[PDB]
Amino acid sequence: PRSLKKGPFIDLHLLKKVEKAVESGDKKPLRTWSRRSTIFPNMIGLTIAVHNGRQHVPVFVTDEMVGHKLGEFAPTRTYRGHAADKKAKKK
Amino acid sequence: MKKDIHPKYEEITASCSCGNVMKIRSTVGHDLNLDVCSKCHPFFTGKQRDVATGGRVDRFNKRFNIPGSK
Amino acid sequence: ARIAGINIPDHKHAVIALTSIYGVGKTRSKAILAAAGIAEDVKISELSEGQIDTLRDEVAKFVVEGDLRREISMSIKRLMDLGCYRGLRHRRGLPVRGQRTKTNARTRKGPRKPIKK
Amino acid sequence: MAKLTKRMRVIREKVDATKQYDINEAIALLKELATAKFVESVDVAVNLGIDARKSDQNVRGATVLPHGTGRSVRVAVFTQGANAEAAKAAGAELVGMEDLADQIKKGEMNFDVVIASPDAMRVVGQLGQVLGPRGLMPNPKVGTVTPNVAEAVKNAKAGQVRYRNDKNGIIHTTIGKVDFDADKLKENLEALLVALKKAKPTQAKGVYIKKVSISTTMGAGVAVDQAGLSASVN
RNA sequence: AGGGCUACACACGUGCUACAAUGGCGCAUACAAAGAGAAGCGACCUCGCGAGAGCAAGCGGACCUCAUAAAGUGCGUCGUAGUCCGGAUUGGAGUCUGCAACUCGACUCCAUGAAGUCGGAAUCGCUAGUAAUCGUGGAUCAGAAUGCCACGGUGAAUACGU
RNA sequence: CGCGGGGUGGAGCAGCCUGGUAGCUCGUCGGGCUCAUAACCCGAAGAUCGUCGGUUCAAAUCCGGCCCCCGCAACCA
RNA sequence: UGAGCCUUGAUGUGUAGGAUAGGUGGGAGGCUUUGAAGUGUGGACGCCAGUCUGCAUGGAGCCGACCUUGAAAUACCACC
């Protein structure tokens, strides 16, 4: 297994996004480039739009996803299935 | 009523007013107020950064580096 | 005296023989024998049943297989209803620990396959 | 198999000519053509004109002879549960289950006949169809398969003989020793002939006895014109 | 700044190691060459199952260290059952380089435990320190070698004939 | 009346007799080869072997029953 | 020369088995020069030299009950 080693991360980018977001409880989805960032208690009930490189994809932040990174809910690679080859695109 | 085909009565006909004496009478939360994940929710419970045990030696509060030293 | 029966290699020395009551690969077995006062280079045929009891009691604390195979079952399934990437790679069957998918999918996703064209 | 050896060559010299014989002169000749140090046994080959297809159209069973043969007839009792003494007092050697289930499985039996209970026979002895020439298993068709085992021991030691077909209408059956007189022998003969005749089908009103040939054991054989209906030498 | 070629329905080129017992298991046991270590590595140290941790004499490398070189040997042990070969996967915990290890990073290690019994079509180097086979170090080098380069262990059949 | 032969992957065949072992030509689908085209090589899938039951470690085969197709039987007159 | 009827005579080279497996009853062996076997002579007799074997001489053997392999077991006489 892999880990986060030993130091403390809160991410600089989510600290400053979250501080302005919490004050209303919630507002419209926060435009996020931070795919490096873990999910945290401070972020519970926010809606984080996560750039995947092509576009932002909405991740709804909630208690069950705190063991995880923002970049896990938001996808990257495309899988061609083998019922039959993928004919179409998905955005 | 066909009595005999119904299972034994030890805890049936006895004591419909019973305690929690070996087992509870009612569970909480099974009517699902949040949808069930079957997960323990990590870094919510618990810690994002690992335990420090092993390599227990007196801390140096002023900057130090093992290859930066000769 | 068979530890547990079903698969033990017969007239085999004691260290490999115990990998069939489960929860005890070689390392834990080594320490379990040391406790009971048993040497490694004995064969497992030489022992009275009361040593077999002293062994079984020291195994019986470690993880039961019934729980071990449940632990991997519940670990993929949890991830898999969540939609984290860990859980998505388990969904397709592909490797999760960095292995190729253009090659070396076989141990998880099964034999090589016909492709219509 | 019938390999060409010494013990037949001497007998084959001592014969005068091979031809089909009147039964009383077949028996007097056959007694001359024993050779062995052991007392030879006498049995009869009778060709039956029945169809000989499975059972309906077969002749199957046993009879008790009025005079017994000079052989012992090695009877075993294959059962799961009997009082041993009661079966031994009838004349049996061995009563049990494990030893007789073991033989009929392995495919070799020390014993010539086994008497079986229905509960022994069912698992081992009942299926076997290509059973060889040593005849190990119990059979229903013979009538040796009975729960009245102690009865079957007492009629086996006193004189009970069997008849059965192969793939053909031929019945070979024990008639006695070469030790015996001609009268006693014709008397054994006629008792068998009457039992196969009682068991004969209704379609067997044509030609029934086709050929008769009489045999002795280690020693050679003598062809017969027919068996006749008589219990006497004259 | 994030994402990718490291994708997956697969085929193919190559190399690795294996499919045993010539070996592997346990315990005991042996000797390398060559080179790297000035920004760096490093005995003893105390902690740690190990990895690693935090301290540090010392070094200039024929002094100290990477590094226990492995294969091979000793003894006792194993029979085709994918095992007593082979050990991949995966769960889980400890550790690491870096704001940051999710798809796409490294290491230790616990438990369970598959494919594969020499493989169709295809398919290559070799004349002897070679071929085969076993391990090592280094170049590169944030973090990662099956590869490349060289080194030493152990070291083959035969070359009639055109 | 009676005798005797046959019932195979989607299509036509082989194997058969004390047996196991699905084999040949097609149609199908995937791969390989040659500098390339070319012919050619290689694998796979496909069956209750007419259907039922029995013996045996083994049945398409041997054994018992049933439905179907055909030659002869010169027969329905 | 078919068919019927009939006198005697044999090979059986199995997956597993030392070799000798048509179905199967009698039935536990033939000691007769050891039943042998054996160079040698002939004979039955075949998945081609293999199973069995007559005999001057030969006390040296098929091969079971047993010992052993198999679904079935084996001698030797019969029956076909």
Q: How far is the C-alpha of D158 from the C-alpha of D188, rounded, in Å?
A: 13
Q: Which helix (H) or strand (E) holds D106?
A: helix D98-106
Taking one residue from A and the other from C, the number of pairs with CB-CB distance under 8 angstroms is 16
Decide: helix, strand or coil at residue D158. Answer: helix
Decide: helix, strand or coil at residue D176. Answer: strand
Residue D46: closest CA among D160, D201, D170: D170
Phi-psi sector, A25: left (phi>0), alpha (psi -120 to 50), beta = left
- Name residue D50's amino acid: I
Q: Which helix (H) or strand (E) holds D221?
A: strand D221-226
Residue D48: closest CA among D168, D162, D134, D137: D168
Chains in touch with C (≥3 Cβ pairs < 8 A): A, B
Q: How far is the C-alpha of D161 from the C-alpha of D142, rounded, in Å?
A: 9
Q: Running DSSP on this structure, what letter comes out for residue B42? A: B
- Both tokens assigned to D139: 């059979």
Q: Residues A29, A59: contact at Cβ < 8 Å?
A: no
- Both tokens assigned to D66: 């009025």
Residue D221: closest CA among D22, D30, D4, D13: D30
Contact C115 A65 (CB under 8 A): no
Quick count: other Cβ atoms within 10 Å of Cβ D115? 28
- Both tokens assigned to C77: 């399934």
Q: How far is the C-alpha of A59 from the C-alpha of A52, rounded, in Å?
A: 11
Residue the block writes with tokens 């960032």 = A37
Q: How far is the C-alpha of D15 from the C-alpha of D220, rounded, in Å?
A: 10
Q: How far is the C-alpha of A73 from the C-alpha of A60, rounded, in Å?
A: 9
- Name residue A32's amino acid: T
Q: Across the interface, which of A3, A40, A66 has its CB nearest the CB of B41?
A: A66
Distances (CA, A) of D233 to A53, C114, D59, D226: 119, 88, 27, 14
Domain extent for B32 = 1-41
- Name residue D169's amino acid: G
Decide: helix, strand or coil at residue C63. Answer: coil
Chains in touch with D (≥3 Cβ pairs < 8 A): none
Q: Where are the alpha helices (DSSP H) in A6-81?
A: 12-21, 70-73
| 3-state percent helix, strand, coil for chain A, nearest multiple of 5 | 20, 15, 60
Q: How far is the C-alpha of C115 from the C-alpha of D13, rounded, in Å?
A: 83
How far is the first Cα of chain D from the last one, in angstroms, to the nearest whole number?
Answer: 38
Nucleotide nearest to D219 (CA to C1'): G77
Quick count: other Cβ atoms within 10 Å of Cβ D68? 16
Per-position DSSP letters for D1-47, written without gaps between them = -----HHHHHHHHH-S----EEHHHHHHHHHHH---SS--EEEEEEE
Phi-psi sector, C96: left (phi>0), alpha (psi -120 to 50), beta = alpha
**B and C: touch, per 3+ CB pairs < 8 A?**
yes
Q: How far is the CA of B7 from the C1' of G54 (A)?
A: 89
Residues 188-227 of D with CB under 7 A from strand G: 210-211, 213, 215-223
Q: Residues D212, D47: contact at Cβ < 8 Å?
A: yes
Q: How far is the C-alpha of C73 from the C-alpha of D136, rounded, in Å?
A: 58
Q: For strand E, is any atom closer than 7 Å to the CB of C81?
A: no
Residue numbers in C near A64 (CB within 8 A): 82
Q: For strand F, is any atom closer than 7 Å to the CB of D17?
A: no
Distances (CA, A) of D165 to C116, D59, D113, D159: 64, 7, 17, 21
Residues 6+ positions from A53 with CB-CB distance below 8 Å: A76
Query: How distant is the alpha carbon of residue B59 from its chain centre?
Result: 35
Which residue of C78, C80, C84 is the best one to mutate when testing the A interface, meaning the one whose CB has the most A CBs within 10 A? C84
Q: Running DSSP on this structure, what letter comes out for residue D214? A: E
- Name residue C112's amino acid: R
Quick count: other Cβ atoms within 10 Å of Cβ A40? 19
Residues 6+ positions from C39 with CB-CB distance below 8 Å: C14, C33
- Name residue C91's amino acid: R
Residue D188: closest CA among D50, D71, D34, D77: D71
- Both tokens assigned to A84: 């039959």
- Both tokens assigned to A87: 């004919």
Residue the block writes with tokens 């007196």 = B58
Q: Residues C38, C18: contact at Cβ < 8 Å?
A: no
Decide: helix, strand or coil at residue C52. Answer: helix
Query: What's the sign of the alpha-carbon dihedral D110, D116, D122, D123?
Result: negative
Burial class (CB within 10 angstroms; exposed 0-12, middle 13-18, buried 19+) of C114: exposed
Quick count: other Cβ atoms within 10 Å of Cβ D59? 22
Residue D31: closest CA among D214, D230, D228, D234: D214
Query: What's the sign of the alpha-carbon dihedral A75, A76, A81, A87?
Result: positive
Decide: helix, strand or coil at residue D95. Answer: strand
Q: Running DSSP on this structure, what letter comes out for residue B44? A: T
Q: How far is the C-alpha of C94 from the C-alpha of C73, rounded, in Å?
A: 16
Q: How far is the C-alpha of D185 from the C-alpha of D233, rounded, in Å?
A: 9
Method: cryo-EM
Question: Roughly what angle, to the nearest 10 degrees, separates helices C85-92 and C65-82?
Answer: 110
- Name residue C47's amino acid: L
Sheet architecture: strand order including D221-226: D21-22, D221-226, D209-216, D41-48, D170-177
Residue D96 φ then ψ, to 5°: -175, -165
Tell me the domain boundaries of chain A: 2-80
- Taking CA D194 as the corner, what is the angle to CA D189 and CA D199, rounded to the nearest 5 degrees? 130
Is B40 a known ligand-binding residue? no
Burial D17-46 (b: 16+ CB within 10 A, else e): eeeebebbebbeebbebbbeeeebbbbbbb
Which residue of B34, B36, B38 is the best one to mutate when testing the C interface, meaning the one whose CB has the most C CBs within 10 A? B38
Q: Residues D210, D218: contact at Cβ < 8 Å?
A: no
Q: How far is the C-alpha of D13 from the C-alpha of D132, rounded, in Å?
A: 32
Residue numbers in B near C77 (CB within 8 A): 38
Q: How far is the C-alpha of C111 from the C-alpha of C107, rounded, in Å?
A: 8
Q: How far is the C-alpha of D160 from the C-alpha of D66, rounded, in Å?
A: 9
How far is the first Cα of chain C from the last one, in angstroms, to the nearest whole number?
Answer: 59
Strands D209-216 and D221-226, sheet pairing: antiparallel
Residue numbers in B near C74 (CB within 8 A): 38
Residue C51: closest CA among C18, C97, C94: C18
Q: How far is the C-alpha of C9 from the C-alpha of C3, rounded, in Å?
A: 11
